[PDB]
């Protein structure tokens, strides 16, 4: 009896909140939120009548871990009283967020329903604004101070993302912001691992819908310029592109049959597109001889035989939207599949049967058939 759901709000105000985060806000018994955008906070207050701002539990000179302990306990206290508590943290609520993990784990240890819903993180915004794929060529993400304290290894051939570069070695809080006086220690490490000429991108996603992202391209040595290091604050994130590209192992690529068997891959060339923040890698052009061949093959393209297009009804689309947008209806459906199933209007006989089964394959067959 009593539960704790933790949701996120994304980074950019309001717009980056997920539909299910909003739905679990409204259905909550009490809301504890920690956001750093005024419109987002106002947006949370109009969707639930019982909200407490967790930001007030920071204080000047007060340890952040002590604030995190208090933030977790304020939620767990309402949980142990049998309330349905929803915790709110901007971005992804479990990405570089201490009190959410502490509160959910303690509630689990005491036998309560606990669950975190994912959200859009600052790393997600970084991928989008910088148009980089973590797949190419791998992504490593560190907390900036932990990266120094435990001397975590770099991967100069993959992406590097550093959070909290604006509070290096700071366990305190100050409403005015951080005095990043240990920033030079981080610069010393980045220079030692990458050299002073390598690129570092100072990233700050736009928090308001009309603002532009900060995507400023520096070298690591330029971070020692006073006017540069003052620009990084509490919502600053560093992206360091790969310094070089690792070679393909032709022996392993023949074992995996990535390329056609008989050919030797290109040793100094990546496939299009290039990373615009990366030192120049020889990259193939967008429209080679293999590319236009597939583009001109579009002239003779027909829907494949095994391609099965969507073929559902208005009633089936509405009931699955409801299961995704209505936590009240979802809780009833999981409690009794058939009693919920025969209650939905206008469902075709197979649609009622598929929804009563609930299996992924039955629901997909019901939405791909239709007489």
Ligand X SMILES: Nc1ncnc2c1ncn2[C@@H]1O[C@H](CSCC[C@H](N)C(=O)O)[C@@H](O)[C@H]1O
| Residues of span 143-182 touching ligand X by CB under 6 A | 163-164, 166
Report, in Å, the least distance between residue 94 CB and ligand X. 7
* Count of chain residues binding its own copies (CB under 8 A): 149
Report, in Å, the least distance between residue 320 CB and its own copies. 4
Which 119-138 residues touch ligand X, going by CB under 6 A? Answer: 121-122
Report, in Å, the least distance between residue 324 CB and its own copies. 4
Rounded to the nearest 10 degrees, the angle between the axes of helix 98-109 and helix 64-80 is 40
Residue 203 interacts with which of its own copies, ligand X, none, CB < 5 to 8 Å by class: ligand X
- Which among 19, 160, 35 is positioned nearest to 88, based on CA atoms? 35
237 near ligand X, rule: CB under 6 A: yes
Burial of 333 (0-12, 13-18, 19+ CB in 10 A): buried
Q: How far is CA 58 from the centre of its chain?
A: 25
Segment near its own copies (CB under 8 A), from 81-89, 225-233, 246-254, 344-352? 246-254
Residue 333 bears catalytic tag: no
User: How far is residue 140's CA from residue 285's CA, in Å, rounded to a whole number?
Assistant: 28
Report, in Å, the least distance between residue 279 CB and its own copies. 17
Residue 64 bears catalytic tag: yes
Which 69-108 residues touch ligand X, going by CB under 6 A? Answer: 89, 91-92, 95-97
Which 332-351 residues touch its own copies, going by CB under 8 A? Answer: 333-334
User: How far is residue 360's CA from residue 363's CA, in Å, rounded to a whole number?
Assistant: 5
340 near ligand X, rule: CB under 6 A: no
DSSP symbols for 248-288: P-HHHHHHHT-S-BTB---SS-BPSSP-TTSSP--B--SS-
31 near ligand X, rule: CB under 6 A: no
Query: Are the C-beta atoms of residues 44 and 35 closer than 8 Å to each other?
Result: yes
Q: How many Å is the Cα radius of gyration of the chain?
A: 25
Tell me which residues touch ligand X (CB under 6 A): 11, 89, 91-92, 95-97, 121-122, 163-164, 166, 203-205, 207, 234-237
């Amino acid at each position: 009896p009593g539960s704790l759901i933790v949701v996120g709000t994304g980074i950019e105000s309001i717009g980056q909140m997920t539909l299910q985060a909003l739905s679990y806000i409204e259905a909550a018994s009490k809301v504890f939120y920690c956001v750093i955008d005024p419109a987002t906070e106002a947006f949370i207050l109009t969707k639930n009548k019982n909200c407490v701002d967790l930001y007030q539990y920071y204080d000047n000179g007060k340890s952040r871990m002590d604030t995190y302990t208090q933030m977790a306990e304020l939620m767990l206290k309402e949980v142990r009283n049998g309330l349905d508590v929803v915790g709110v943290f901007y971005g992804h609520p479990g990405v570089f967020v201490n009190p959410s993990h502490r509160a959910l784990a303690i509630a689990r240890s005491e036998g309560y329903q606990a669950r975190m819903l994912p959200g859009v993180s600052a790393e997600d915004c970084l991928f989008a604004d910088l148009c980089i794929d973590p797949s190419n060529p791998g992504c490593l993400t560190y907390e900036a101070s932990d990266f120094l304290i435990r001397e975590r290894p770099v991967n100069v051939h993959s992406h590097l993302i550093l959070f909290q570069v604006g509070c290096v070695g700071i366990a305190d809080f100050n409403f005015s912001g951080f005095d990043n006086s240990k920033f030079t220690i981080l610069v010393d490490r980045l220079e030692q691992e990458y050299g002073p000429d390598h690129t570092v991108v100072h990233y700050i996603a736009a928090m308001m819908p009309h603002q532009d992202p900060v995507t400023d391209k520096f070298t690591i040595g330029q971070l020692r310029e006073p006017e540069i290091a003052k620009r990084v604050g509490g919502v600053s994130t560093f992206y360091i592109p790969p310094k070089a590209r690792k070679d393909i192992n032709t022996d392993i690529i023949r074992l995996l049959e990535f390329l056609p068997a008989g050919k030797v891959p290109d040793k100094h060339t990546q496939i299009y597109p290039p990373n615009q923040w990366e030192p120049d890698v020889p990259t193939l052009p967008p429209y080679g001889q293999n590319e236009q061949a597939a583009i001109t093959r579009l002239e003779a393209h027909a829907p494949p035989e095994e391609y099965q297009p969507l073929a559902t009804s208005k009633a089936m689309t509405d009931v699955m939207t409801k299961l995704a947008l209505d936590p009240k209806a979802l809780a009833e459906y999981k409690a009794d599949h058939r009693a919920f199933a025969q209650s939905v209007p206008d469902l075709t006989p197979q649609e009622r049967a598929a929804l009563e089964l609930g299996d992924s394959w039955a629901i997909r067959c019901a939405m791909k058939n239709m007489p």
